[PDB]
Design a protein around this ligand. Structure first.
Ligand SMILES: Cc1cc2nc3c(=O)[nH]c(=O)nc-3n(C[C@H](O)[C@H](O)[C@H](O)COP(=O)(O)OP(=O)(O)OC[C@H]3O[C@@H](n4cnc5c(N)ncnc54)[C@H](O)[C@@H]3O)c2cc1C
Ligand SMILES: NC(=O)c1ccc[n+]([C@@H]2O[C@H](COP(=O)([O-])OP(=O)(O)OC[C@H]3O[C@@H](n4cnc5c(N)ncnc54)[C@H](O)[C@@H]3O)[C@@H](O)[C@H]2O)c1
Ligand SMILES: O=C(O)c1cccc2c1OCCO2
Ligand SMILES: [Mg+2]
Lengths: 1216, 107, 54
């Protein structure tokens, strides 16, 4: 049996001093990075004046000779939307391959009338790209109805001539401007003109981010065929005068990541070597493009092996990009220069600023890391670039510097830095095809600066170029970009020739972070401190984590019944690692039923003392516990990994979530709780095994901070991390009498639920067990004679809808993560993928290919993607479902499991193709994705089908089209919506989490209504209000006044104002995402009145919160609602058979205590969802305007929209 | 239509143009239910006309118009109310219903 | 353009024929100018060969 974590994440090679200096700089504070760069980039006053003069000369030439689209817009008086729509139409017409066919369609069908009739795929799928071309502004999603209107308008106004001009424009742009050519042969033909003028070329075959083995093989053969064509054309010109190729390592392997480093070195490296061997034979350059920051150091391991490989000796064409916007850049250069010296290879080093800036900001914020791996002020990148050029120019004997930039100021600075001595081969400049030629035609040639320029030349079809064209446009198109500024008439040449080195040198704090970019720790500002994660791409972090994880496996973890009086005796058994039952993680002593009942009585005795701790001090306990969990995170990770079968990545996020719960509920307490918000009393917190620290901590922390003593009943499968959480909370100051841990099975849970002093239950788990708890609680009333509150957060049958406008590679990554992360053992996991028919086969092929790249095994290795399921019984249940589907003839795709999985309980990630959504009839809590296909016109019916399961937890939509977003999000009934991203990993206070129907009672965990459920009088949550008044409520209040029910009419109007229906907030979170929180109607509320006035109050409460009602016909109160306004009557039904008229979304009950108890039992017996029931006596309705609390009559909806999905962040284009 | 607004000129020609900015991403939900009902009946041409009406309807348009500082000048498209339908044929009635429902109206 | 240039004379007629104050008459002529320019622009944005007159 392999020792735990003995092979967690060993580096590819021992880290040299130079490699360690790189890692040390990964997230170095910006104020520490800049001073040495300022010093390295400093030049004499004479040189700075000469450079400013050169830059001015270049900029004057640029502005003196200065679009095709702009002239088209002008000629036909197009609006911006018409220009975009026209280019989308032109793009579509160019998907028609035959020219004569296209021209006939234009003349005879498009121009004369309905373009829609002739052109499964929206015309406007790529309109975000064309929007950038036409307007310079990025929008993440497409207003396809505005574009359709604009296209109809422009065609009806201008006819065939404008279509012809648009087609010719788009043909030129996509065939000659965004690419040098559609194929490498075409690109080579078009390169001769500028090669004769002294330019050179590096061809970019536009591949990246392979999703499957087949994709990677396709990109490989594309590079190989390109190298032959380029090498044939080079014809012995060599690596400096002749053309070369650029490759992206992410194109050549579907799992190019540090976590998969062994596969990268074993499988990706030989492919690069084979391409490099061919480049060597033709003697052309082969450049490795730089990608995301978490791939930098991994790529150095490939560069090292290749440069030391004797089979490649004799060739100096290997090239490597370094990104000056990265904090490691100078240290990477030191490493590369030294590698060039050791290997004797003159490495071609392309210095760039960097293409992934927005994405790096978003990633570091999402991951809660210490700092960014890139600068946050554009001027810092400029100084970094110049400083790194100084380093490169001192080493031209051993490397070949290649200064890629379109910035005339940067260029001029380096031109003068390099000095007067030049020869071809010493260094070169580089630029992008169709972007940098205006500048570099002022540089290349004896009549200019007589310095060479290599043109980075994209090569590819329309489909290939459009895929990531947005990122490429933002490089030179953001407000801080030189190319954007040179075109801005409000930017002077003196501004453009400003010396970034001297500007930074003179700032008050050299290297200060951008004011408008939050460090990840500060995402929530003054509200609370964000939890911190760990960078599993950082070798220092991996090495320290390895030791902490090993040490955690040496610990004698135990879980005991921790009563107020001390630990109790009980039946003791071992806890085994679900991924390897030979690995004993610890021992649990389980609680007797007698001791569980004793614990409730002790909690009841202690309830006054804990309620008397002021809310601010209770919140301080939670904040202290959060600090303790943050400090203990590495040890907690190890326990979660081994006890719960989680990967390190998922364990980090789990501990972060627990920290966030603690800090969120602490802050919410400080915002709300006062003396009148009295605690319920002892609360039983029952938690699941799949989030054994986070949900455990969340429920307990909320109940405790609301002033309630807690009986914590963790899942029988995962008691050890629960015991450690309780230990931490007690260390943080929670008294033993306020937090008792009762390990054991459902018998312990049930004994707690049934105990007379139990004042509330927080349950997260299966819908079936929640229903059993609901039935037990319906037997009971509080001492005041009211229902015992139950928060029951249960399963989902979560769907994602994907239309033909979505990017398949994005979809597949989000599906693989959503469905199979944590072996599908998230309540949020994707269960049903719905693919529009026209793209379903392509996406399914990619999905199956991606499925087979997953590594399944014991989770104490970083390379493991999917761990075990929690128990053999879970495994058996999931497998029975798979075999039932297989026996029905459904196509089943499964990854093959390694033999080592036999010592644990594993289910292979599985894809099952269903005919109809109704083929799936129960939540299958495992790594099992079901796929259905739908016709575009059946989208609305499909949303009906998703809603028809009765669940309503998470839901995903992948589309670029605003009409589809509006339609689907308005019709879907789920608590957590996700647009153009995965559907898992809800973040406390950012995506408040929880659903409706069979998925939950609410209120949402990690949301602002949660604590109010845990006190007898709910406070007003922060930001909880709405200026909107339900119009049916208003009609009802007028009807009441017309009937003479003046007091009830006033109460109705007050309910209308008090309701927060219509609340619509954006919650603070990471850049590149919009996180929305809205309050909607719940649905149909069951009203069980006893008196006419009670009915009117119930109806006012329900209508004010947007609901319809079903009124108990057995109340005999039909004559009290005569002659209702039609608007109110539409919302009112009478029910004699409550079970037949559901599902309801809540209930309001009026009666004395025994009437309430009887009704509560009848409601618990209704099939389907657990209903949030509020009861009041007639006297309570008369005395208390809040007898029914409106918090529980609205439904919370969270929506998280990935606004970077189009390829960039529009808001951050204004941040420089 | 309103004088000094973008629908006005379209009343004065025999085929109305699409006015500037005249579109909406919202689809009437009753229109959607009607289209599905037509689908179930096999009324394929009418269901298509209904979906097309749902899309081309500008019900829900909500614009801020350029004007002086210190003022917000808003322009919005709502349902008209209840539309009188005088059909002759079943298909005509379905098309009339589609048009009226797509624009948020009762009939 | 003609109504703008001739606004003072138009004001005099509107004041005396229609009982308007000078301020109201200015706004009246402005509104006429704006109708002209607005419908001119709306036409340039929309009308093509298929939008036949009544
Ligand atoms: C031929 C060529 C090849 C290239 N290959 C690659 C590659 O393989 N990998 C790669 O990542 N990039 C690559 N780039 C660079 C990238 O695509 C952009 O073109 C480049 O960063 C633009 O910088 P600049 O000197 O042209 O223009 P500038 O306007 O001078 O610089 C713009 C750059 O500043 C940086 N920046 C913008 N805002 C901020 C901010 N708030 N804080 C910090 N920095 C900021 C960004 O890097 C941005 O791209 C290449 C560029 C060229 C010309
Ligand atoms: N909506 C959410 O936030 C959310 C979050 C996580 C998990 N879940 C759901 O949790 C389920 C998986 O977790 P699980 O397997 O631990 O669920 P579960 O219903 O099996 O177990 C949850 C808890 O209920 C307890 N329990 C079992 N029988 C009981 C009884 N008769 N009386 C009182 N308590 C009893 C268990 O001991 C455990 O602590 C899934 O269905 C998942 O969707 C929902
Ligand atoms: O996967 C989720 O969306 C999710 C939902 C609730 C709580 C969590 C979750 O994942 C992170 C840990 O705690
Ligand atoms: Mg269970």
């Amino acid at each position: 049996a392999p020792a735990p974590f003995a092979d967690f994440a060993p580096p590819v090679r021992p880290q040299s001093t130079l490699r360690r200096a790189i890692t040390a700089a990964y997230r170095r504070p910006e104020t520490e990075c800049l001073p040495p760069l300022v010093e390295a980039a400093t030049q004499s006053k004479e040189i700075r004046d000469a450079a400013a003069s050169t830059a001015r000369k270049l900029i004057e030439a640029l502005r003196g000779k200065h679009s095709g689209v702009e002239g088209l817009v002008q000629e036909y008086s197009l609006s911006s939307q018409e220009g975009v729509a026209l280019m989308c139409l032109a793009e579509a017409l160019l998907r028609i391959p035959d020219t004569a066919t296209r021209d006939a369609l234009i003349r005879d069908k498009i121009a004369d009338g309905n373009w829609k009739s002739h052109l499964s795929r929206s015309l406007f799928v790529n309109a975000a790209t064309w929007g950038l071309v036409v307007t310079g502004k990025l929008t993440s999603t497409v207003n396809d109805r505005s574009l359709a209107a604009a296209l109809t308008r422009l065609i009806s106004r201008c006819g065939e001539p404008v279509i012809r001009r648009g087609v010719d424009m788009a043909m030129r742009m996509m065939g000659e401007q965004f690419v040098t050519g559609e194929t490498i042969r075409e690109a080579l033909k078009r390169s001769k003109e500028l090669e004769e003028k002294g330019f050179s070329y590096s061809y970019d075959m536009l591949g990246e981010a392979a999703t499957t083995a087949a994709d990677a093989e396709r990109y490989y053969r594309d590079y190989e065929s390109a190298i032959h064509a380029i090498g044939k054309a080079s014809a012995g010109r060599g690596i400096y005068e002749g053309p070369g190729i650029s490759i992206k390592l992410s194109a050549l392997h579907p799992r190019y990541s540090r976590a998969q480093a062994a596969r990268v070195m074993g499988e990706l490296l030989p492919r690069v070597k084979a391409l490099a061997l061919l480049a060597k034979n033709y003697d052309i350059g082969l450049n490795i493009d730089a990608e995301e920051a978490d791939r930098l150091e991994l790529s150095l391991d490939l560069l090292e092996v290749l440069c030391l490989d004797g089979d490649l000796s004799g060739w100096n064409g290997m090239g490597f990009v370094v990104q000056a916007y990265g904090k490691r850049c100078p240290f990477v250069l030191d490493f590369i220069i030294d590698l060039a010296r050791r290997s004797g290879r003159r490495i071609m080093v392309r210095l760039v600023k960097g293409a992934y800036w927005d994405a790096e900001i978003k990633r570091a914020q999402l991951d809660g890391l210490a700092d960014f791996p890139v600068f946050t002020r554009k001027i810092h990148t400029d100084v970094s670039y110049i400083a790194c050029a100084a380093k490169l120019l001192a080493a031209t004997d051993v490397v070949f510097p290649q200064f890629a930039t379109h910035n005339a100021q940067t260029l001029a600075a380096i031109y003068h830095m390099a000095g007067k001595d030049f020869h071809v081969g010493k260094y070169e400049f580089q630029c992008l095809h169709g972007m940098g030629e205006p500048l570099y035609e002022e540089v290349v040639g004896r009549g200019k600066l007589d310095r060479p320029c290599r043109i980075y030349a994209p090569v590819g079809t329309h489909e290939t170029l459009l895929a990531y064209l947005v990122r490429r446009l933002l490089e030179n198109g953001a407000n801080s970009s030189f190319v954007h500024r040179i075109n801005d008439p409000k930017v002077s040449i003196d501004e453009l020739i400003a010396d970034p080195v001297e500007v930074v040198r003179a700032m008050p704090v050299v290297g200060a972070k951008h004011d408008r970019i939050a460090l990840p720790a500060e995402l929530f500002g003054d509200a609370r401190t964000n939890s911190a994660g760990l960078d599993l791409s950082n070798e220092e972090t991996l090495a320290s984590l390895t030791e902490a994880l090993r040490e955690s496996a040496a610990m004698k973890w135990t879980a005991l019944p921790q009563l107020a009086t001390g630990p109790a005796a009980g039946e003791t058994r071992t806890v085994l690692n679900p991924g390897d039952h030979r690995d004993v993680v610890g021992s649990v002593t389980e609680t007797s039923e007698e001791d569980a009942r004793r614990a409730v009585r002790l909690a009841a005795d202690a309830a006054p003392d804990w309620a008397a701790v002021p809310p601010s001090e209770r919140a301080a306990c939670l904040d202290r516990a959060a600090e303790l969990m943050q400090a203990r995170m590495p040890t907690l990770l190890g326990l979660i990994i081994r006890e719960a079968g989680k990967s390190a990545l998922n364990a980090i996020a789990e501990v972060r979530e627990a920290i966030d719960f603690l800090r969120y509920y602490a802050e919410q307490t400080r915002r709300t709780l006062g003396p009148g918000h009295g605690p319920l009393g002892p609360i039983v917190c029952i938690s699941p095994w799949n989030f054994p620290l986070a949900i455990f901590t969340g429920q307990i922390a909320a109940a405790l901070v609301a002033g309630n003593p807690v009986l914590a009943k963790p899942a029988e499968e995962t008691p050890l991390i629960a015991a450690e959480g309780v230990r931490i909370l007690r260390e943080a100051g929670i008294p033993a009498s306020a937090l008792q841990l009762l390990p054991g099975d459902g018998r312990v849970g049930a004994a707690l639920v049934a105990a007379a002093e139990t004042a509330g239950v927080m349950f997260t788990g299966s819908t079936e067990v929640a229903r059993l708890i609901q039935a037990q609680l319906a037997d009971r009333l509080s001492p005041a004679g009211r229902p015992i509150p139950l928060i029951a957060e249960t399963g989902g049958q979560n769907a994602m809808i994907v239309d033909s406008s979505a990017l398949a590679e994005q979809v597949v990554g989000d599906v693989i993560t959503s469905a199979f992360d944590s072996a599908g053992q998230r309540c949020s996991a994707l269960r049903v993928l719905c693919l529009q028919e026209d793209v379903a086969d392509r996406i399914l092929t990619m999905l199956k290919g991606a499925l087979h790249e997953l590594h399944i095994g014991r989770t104490d290795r970083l390379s493991v993607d999917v761990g075990p399921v929690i128990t053999s019984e879970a495994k058996d249940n999931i497998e029975k479902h798979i075999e039932r589907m297989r026996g029905l003839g459904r196509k089943v795709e499964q990854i093959g499991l390694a033999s080592e999985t036999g010592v644990g309980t594993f289910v292979p990630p599985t894809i099952i193709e269903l005919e109809k959504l109704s083929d799936l009839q129960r939540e299958v809590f495992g790594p099992v994705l079901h796929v259905i296909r739908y016709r575009r016109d059946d989208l609305d019916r499909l949303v009906d089908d998703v809603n028809a399961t009765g669940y309503g937890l998470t839901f995903g939509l992948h589309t670029r089209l605003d009409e589809t977003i509006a339609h689907v999000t308005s019709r879907i009934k789920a608590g957590n919506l996700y647009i153009n991203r995965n559907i898992i990993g809800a973040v406390v206070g950012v995506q408040p989490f929880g659903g409706r129907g069979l998925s939950g009672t609410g209120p949402k965990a990690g949301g602002p209504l949660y604590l109010g459920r845990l006190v007898t009088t709910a406070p007003v949550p922060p930001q909880h209000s709405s200026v909107h008044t339900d119009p049916v409520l208003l009609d009802f209040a007028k009807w009441l006044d017309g009937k003479g029910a003046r007091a009830e009419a006033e109460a109705a109007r007050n309910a209308g104002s008090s309701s927060a229906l219509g609340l619509d907030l954006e919650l603070p979170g990471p850049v590149g995402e919009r996180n929305l929180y809205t309050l909607h109607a719940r649905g149909r509320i069951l009203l069980v009145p006893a008196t006419e006035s009670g009915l009117y109050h119930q109806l006012a409460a329900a209508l004010a919160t947007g609901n319809s009602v079903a009124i108990d016909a057995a109340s005999g109160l039909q004559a009290s609602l005569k002659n209702l306004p039609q608007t109110v009557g539409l919302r009112v039904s009478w029910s004699k058979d409550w079970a037949a008229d559901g599902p309801f979304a809540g209930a309001l009950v009026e009666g004395d205590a025994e009437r309430i108890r009887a009704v509560n039992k009848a409601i618990a017996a209704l099939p389907g969802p657990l209903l949030l029931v509020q009861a009041a006596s007639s006297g309570e309705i008369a005395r208390n305007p809040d007898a029914y609390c409106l918090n529980w009559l609205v439904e919370e909806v969270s929506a998280s929209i990935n606004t970077a999905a189009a390829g960039g962040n529009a808001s951050l284009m204004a941040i420089g």
